[PDB]
């Protein structure tokens, strides 16, 4: 859209920031590391949020992990919950 670059603001993106920094559990480290390596944001939230914007990090990370894997790191990095659920969803 436009105003959809994570409309939960930088604030909740910072919440997710800490829920990205929790080392997570999935291929998160390997995958995003060479992913946000691409974008070279260093900060993995730049990566995650730019996918949230219009993709970016998903290149290398998605090469490494599978769709199901990033389902995990999805709810992992947003809910800070990489083990409990592969998908919290609701």
Domain ranges (residues) in the chain:
1-90
CA 87 from centre of chain: 14
Token pair for residue 73?
């790191």
Q: Which CATH class is domain 1-90?
A: mainly alpha
Breaks in the chain (C–N > 2.5 Å) following residue: none
Tell me how far apart the alpha carbons of residues 75 and 18 are, in angstroms, rounded to a whole number: 13
Experimental approach was NMR
Q: How far is residue 73 from each of residues 1, 3, 24, 25, measured CA to CA in Å? A: 24, 24, 7, 8
- Other C-beta atoms lying within 10 Å of the C-beta of residue 8: 12
Q: Is 73:19 a contact under the CB 8 Å cutoff?
A: no
Strand extents, DSSP E, the chain = none
Q: Is 81:88 a contact under the CB 8 Å cutoff?
A: yes
Token pair for residue 27?
């291929």
* Start-to-end Cα distance in the chain: 23
């Amino acid at each position: 859209h436009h105003q959809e670059l994570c409309t939960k603001g930088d604030d909740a993106l910072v919440t997710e920031l800490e829920c990205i920094r929790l080392r997570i559990s999935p291929e998160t480290n390997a995958a995003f590391d060479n992913a946000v390596q691409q974008l070279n944001c260093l900060n993995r939230a730049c990566a995650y949020r730019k996918m949230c914007a219009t993709n970016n990090l998903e290149q290398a990370m998605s090469v490494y992990f599978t769709n199901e894997q990033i389902k995990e790191i999805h709810d992992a990095a947003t809910a800070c919950d990489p083990e409990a659920h592969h998908e919290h969803d609701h």
